Design a protein around this nucleic acid. Structure first.
Ligand code: XG4
Ligand code: MG
Ligand code: MG
Ligand code: MG
Ligand code: MG
Ligand code: MG
Ligand code: MN
Length: 756
DNA sequence: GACCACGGCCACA
DNA sequence: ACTGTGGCCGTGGTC
């Protein structure tokens, strides 16, 4: 099983390393035969003698094109003759690529920025994370002496914790008497001891929570300020720091550092992403939080240091428990994209698609197009029409079916061969014309994009089937992961075609796909209402909610299944409508915002405040109860009563201040803000105290009783002391709770005055 | 000062 | 930095 690839330089020559794990043994395979290269498309196929001769300087050394070779590749759907330029070392390419492009005889260069170790995986056709090898994992967390003001790592690492299949342990230098704590003399002997552990257990995966930006760098600064060699690598190296955008990421050679923090946020939608919040939201059981003010006082006084030890052990224990959960899915993404788990676990959706496309492009001998430069990125800033959304027949509906298309956009690309390489091709024999936008797509040869999506959706439907044969719950989950992933990947391949900075950008392709989707959806809605007597209650991009006005449950289901047979026989090719559920009742407030309950009482809510992370809990909790009494028993009087009980709890300050916290994330640097809302205003006064306010941090503020702007009486929640503060009951009554339930109960005649 | 468009955030598909 | 569609609120201009 391949884990990762990199390269070293032996006497100026690149040497690929492949970090494998086979038969429970860690092996390092070397390849000294791979040559770096990129492509060049010249004006004449004869000037290459001059192109052989361009040189450049790197590090007191002239860089030269080693060898050249005539290649025929597929570019723009037609075979073009391209020139392959071989080099000695990968770092030669950036030092010479511009000197080549600037040559008049060459029009442009291609595939000049693909990293060596990743090109190896693509060209050599290798796929990491495949096989049945069980990787040895080990989590770790630390505890630190913090004071306000002192620079990063000014103080010491008080304790280090770790956890695996043998349990969790703690290592510190102050004497803490507990069965899972190991005491040593000093910090050195602690960090040195922790190194002895990792080297001894030899884990393939090092699991952390935010180790990319804290744990490893703290262990770095002390190790130098103290004089230890952090030989965590299996080659005897130290943790290697990279630059993942504004923030950083940490690699551990020979192993996979799995920072759960990027994985969690990108996967789960939580108002806060603390360890205690993430743990309790994934496993249901809560987790205690000891703060930095406590562990510093507990250290300098020596009092209640055992409480710090429990938290330290808990941190390591829970991150391991979380790592065992989220890693196997991240492994499937690695196999699907064809890049290391370390890379795909922190990659944006766009970059994951490009890597998938680049591998696909290499398999089909498709010369990859460059990324756009400034002028092209300026052009590609347009917009195009997307999915159709109807205005919901606002109110309460009964006996509803939801009919939806199977992968509507990827099925359109497949059915109509939508691809940049099939758009407006001359000499076409069979073409398909896009509605509204009139773009013609050649069907003589299968397009690049349709051929990949076809293989993906074919593999998706293969997985949704074999899953049923398999019995082991793990294989069910593992396989199910690939099923959902293929879908996100497929839709992102569509989104790639409209992406400003995408290599296979094609606005015509992108807007043709949506144009067909509008036609197929509105056609289906036309048929079901005219040829079958339905009334479409609400419809988003790929499906709709409909019912027979009046009628009975089965009558709605029977005619719905009849309509499906009629419409799926009239639907061209890979296009298909499916029965995706019956629902006893359903409330449709507005576009993107509705709630629905099935036959068994499962309430599904979409878009409403109850699901939005930037609303107070007291607002969600009561809208949930109002929706419940509305869809569970239709008890409108109990629903209107509930609003009256909670509104009196607020005015009498009986509701816990924790339920009135609004969580909103800042998205940019505070100088770049043009509108200071309450959450930004709070984050600006925090920057006046010198706190880390970076893009991505969540502001959690409560509004205090007072007058003026909201941003003048909003304080962070960790700053709220109930004895000294009183929250603004009037604000949360008139601006949070009542507005959220009135938009629902307005359909029943009730107004806010009737709810206070 | 009452009225209103609009950053800005997060959600749906 | 995958796409477009969309609801919603505090906040400042505006006559
Ligand atoms: N670029 C981009 N387009 C998207 C995304 N999500 C949806 N689209 C568009 C493109 C998608 O083709 C369309 C609908 O996507 P589904 O409803 O998630 N497909 P399913 O197989 O689940 O249908 P059914 O419900 O019957 O199982 O929304 C996205 O995240 N990114
Ligand atoms: Mg890597
Ligand atoms: Mg290229
Ligand atoms: Mg769909
Ligand atoms: Mg689906
Ligand atoms: Mg759908
Ligand atoms: Mn865009």
């Amino acid at each position: 099983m391949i884990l990762d690839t990199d390269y070293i330089t032996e006497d100026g020559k690149p040497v690929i390393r492949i970090f494998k794990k086979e038969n429970g043994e860690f092996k390092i395979e070397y390849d000294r035969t791979f040559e770096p290269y990129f492509y060049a498309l010249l004006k004449d196929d004869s000037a290459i003698e001059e192109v052989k001769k361009i040189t450049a300087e790197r590090h007191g050394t002239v860089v030269t094109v080693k060898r050249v070779e005539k290649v025929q590749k597929k570019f723009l759907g037609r075979p073009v003759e391209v020139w392959k330029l071989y080099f000695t070392h990968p770092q030669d390419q950036p030092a010479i690529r511009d000197k080549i492009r600037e040559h008049p005889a060459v029009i442009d260069i291609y595939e000049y920025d693909t990293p060596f170790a990743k090109r190896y995986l693509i060209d050599k056709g290798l796929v990491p994370m495949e096989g049945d090898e069980e990787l040895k994992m080990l989590a770790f967390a630390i505890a630190t002496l913090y004071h306000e003001g002192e620079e990063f790592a000014e103080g010491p690492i008080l304790m280090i914790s770790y956890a695996d299949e043998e349990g969790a342990r703690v290592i510190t230098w102050k004497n803490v008497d507990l069965p899972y704590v190991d005491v040593v003399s000093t910090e050195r002997e602690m960090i040195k001891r922790f190194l002895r552990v990792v080297k001894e257990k030899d884990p393939d995966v090092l699991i952390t929570y935010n180790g990319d930006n804290f744990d490893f760098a703290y262990l770095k600064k002390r190790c130098e300020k103290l004089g230890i060699n952090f030989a965590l690598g299996r080659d005897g190296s130290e943790p290697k720091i990279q630059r993942m955008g504004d923030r950083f990421a940490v690699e551990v050679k020979g192993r996979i550092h799995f920072d759960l923090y990027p994985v969690i946020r990108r996967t789960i939608n939580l108002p806060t992403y603390t360890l205690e919040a993430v743990y309790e939201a994934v496993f249901g059981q809560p987790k205690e939080k000891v703060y930095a003010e406590e562990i510093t006082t507990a250290w300098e006084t020596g009092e209640n240091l055992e409480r710090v030890a429990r938290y330290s052990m808990e941190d390591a224990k829970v991150t391991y428990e979380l790592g065992k959960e989220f890693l196997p899915m991240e492994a499937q993404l690695s196999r699907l994209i064809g890049q290391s788990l370390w890379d795909v676990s922190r990659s944006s959706t766009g970059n994951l698609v490009e890597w998938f496309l680049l591998r696909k492009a290499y398999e089909r001998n498709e010369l990859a197009p460059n990324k756009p430069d400034e002028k092209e990125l300026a052009r590609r800033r347009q917009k195009y029409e997307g999915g159709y959304v109807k205005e919901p027949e606002r109110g309460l509906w009964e006996n509803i079916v939801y009919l939806d298309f199977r992968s509507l956009y990827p099925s359109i690309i497949i059915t109509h061969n939508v691809s940049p390489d099939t758009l407006n091709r001359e000499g076409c024999g069979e073409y398909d014309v896009a509605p509204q936008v009139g773009h013609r797509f050649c069907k003589d040869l299968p397009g690049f994009i349709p051929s990949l999506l076809g293989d993906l959706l074919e593999e998706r439907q293969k997985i949704k089937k074999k899953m049923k044969a398999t019995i082991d719950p793990i294989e069910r989950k593992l396989l199910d992961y690939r099923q959902r992933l293929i879908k996100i990947l497929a839709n992102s391949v569509y989104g790639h075609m409209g992406f400003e900075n995408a290599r296979w950008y094609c606005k015509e392709c992108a807007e043709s796909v949506t144009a067909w989707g509008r036609e197929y959806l509105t056609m289906t809605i036309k048929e079901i209402e005219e040829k079958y007597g339905f009334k479409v209650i609400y419809s988003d991009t790929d499906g709709f909610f409909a019912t027979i006005p009046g009628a009975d449950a089965e009558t709605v289901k029977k005619k719905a299944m009849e309509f499906l047979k009629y419409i799926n026989a009239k639907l061209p090719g890979a296009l298909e409508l499916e029965y995706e559920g019956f629902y006893k009742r359903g409330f449709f407030v507005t576009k993107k915002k509705y709630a629905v309950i099935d036959e068994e009482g499962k309430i599904t809510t979409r878009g409403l405040e109850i699901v939005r992370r930037d609303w107070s809990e007291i607002a969600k909790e009561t809208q949930a109860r109002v929706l419940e009494a509305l869809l569970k028993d239709g008890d409108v009087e109990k629903a209107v009563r509930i609003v009256k009980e909670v509104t009196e709890k607020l005015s009498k300050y009986e509701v816990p201040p924790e339920k009135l916290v609004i969580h909103k994330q800042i998205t940019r640097d505070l100088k770049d803000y043009k509108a200071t809302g309450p959450h930004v205003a709070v984050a600006k006064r925090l920057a006046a105290r010198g706190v880390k306010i970076r893009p991505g941090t969540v502001i959690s503020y409560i509004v205090l009783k007072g007058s003026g702007r909201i941003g003048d009486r909003a304080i962070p929640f960790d700053e709220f002391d109930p004895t000294k503060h009183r929250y603004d009951a009037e604000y949360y009554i008139e601006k949070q709770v009542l507005p959220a339930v009135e938009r629902i109960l307005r359909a029943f005649g009730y107004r806010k005055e009737d709810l206070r």
